[PDB]
């Protein structure tokens, strides 16, 4: 299986990637405001 079936377009691979990144970013802003020793945010 040297030749295989070549996956042509890459935008798929690098869209998902950067989406999870743009999302973990939000799930990160929150980590400070979890549980009893969590902290409040002023918007």
């Amino acid at each position: 299986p040297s030749n295989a079936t070549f996956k042509n377009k890459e935008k798929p691979q690098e869209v998902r990637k950067a989406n999870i990144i743009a999302a973990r970013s939000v799930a990160d802003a929150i980590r400070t405001s979890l549980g009893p020793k969590g902290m409040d945010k002023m918007i």
């Binding site: 299986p1 040297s2 030749n3 295989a4 070549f6």
Partner: protein
């Protein structure tokens, strides 16, 4: 000389891996890290060459 195609990276990964459990404590995760990150070289070789990354890794390390 050493032998490429990942082999060299693999032996190191395996050797650091086995001594990770013998390190223990805080470094136990760092050693595990170092070796696991090394495995990207063979995986991204297998990737570019058109084979399964886990497959080639788990066939090869074993």
């Amino acid at each position: 000389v050493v032998y490429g195609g990942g082999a060299a990276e693999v032996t190191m990964s395996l050797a650091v891996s086995e001594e990770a459990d013998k390190q223990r404590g805080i470094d136990q995760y760092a050693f595990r890290g170092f070796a696991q990150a090394l495995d990207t070289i063979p995986m991204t070789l297998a990737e570019n060459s058109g084979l399964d990354p886990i497959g080639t890794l788990s066939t090869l390390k074993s």
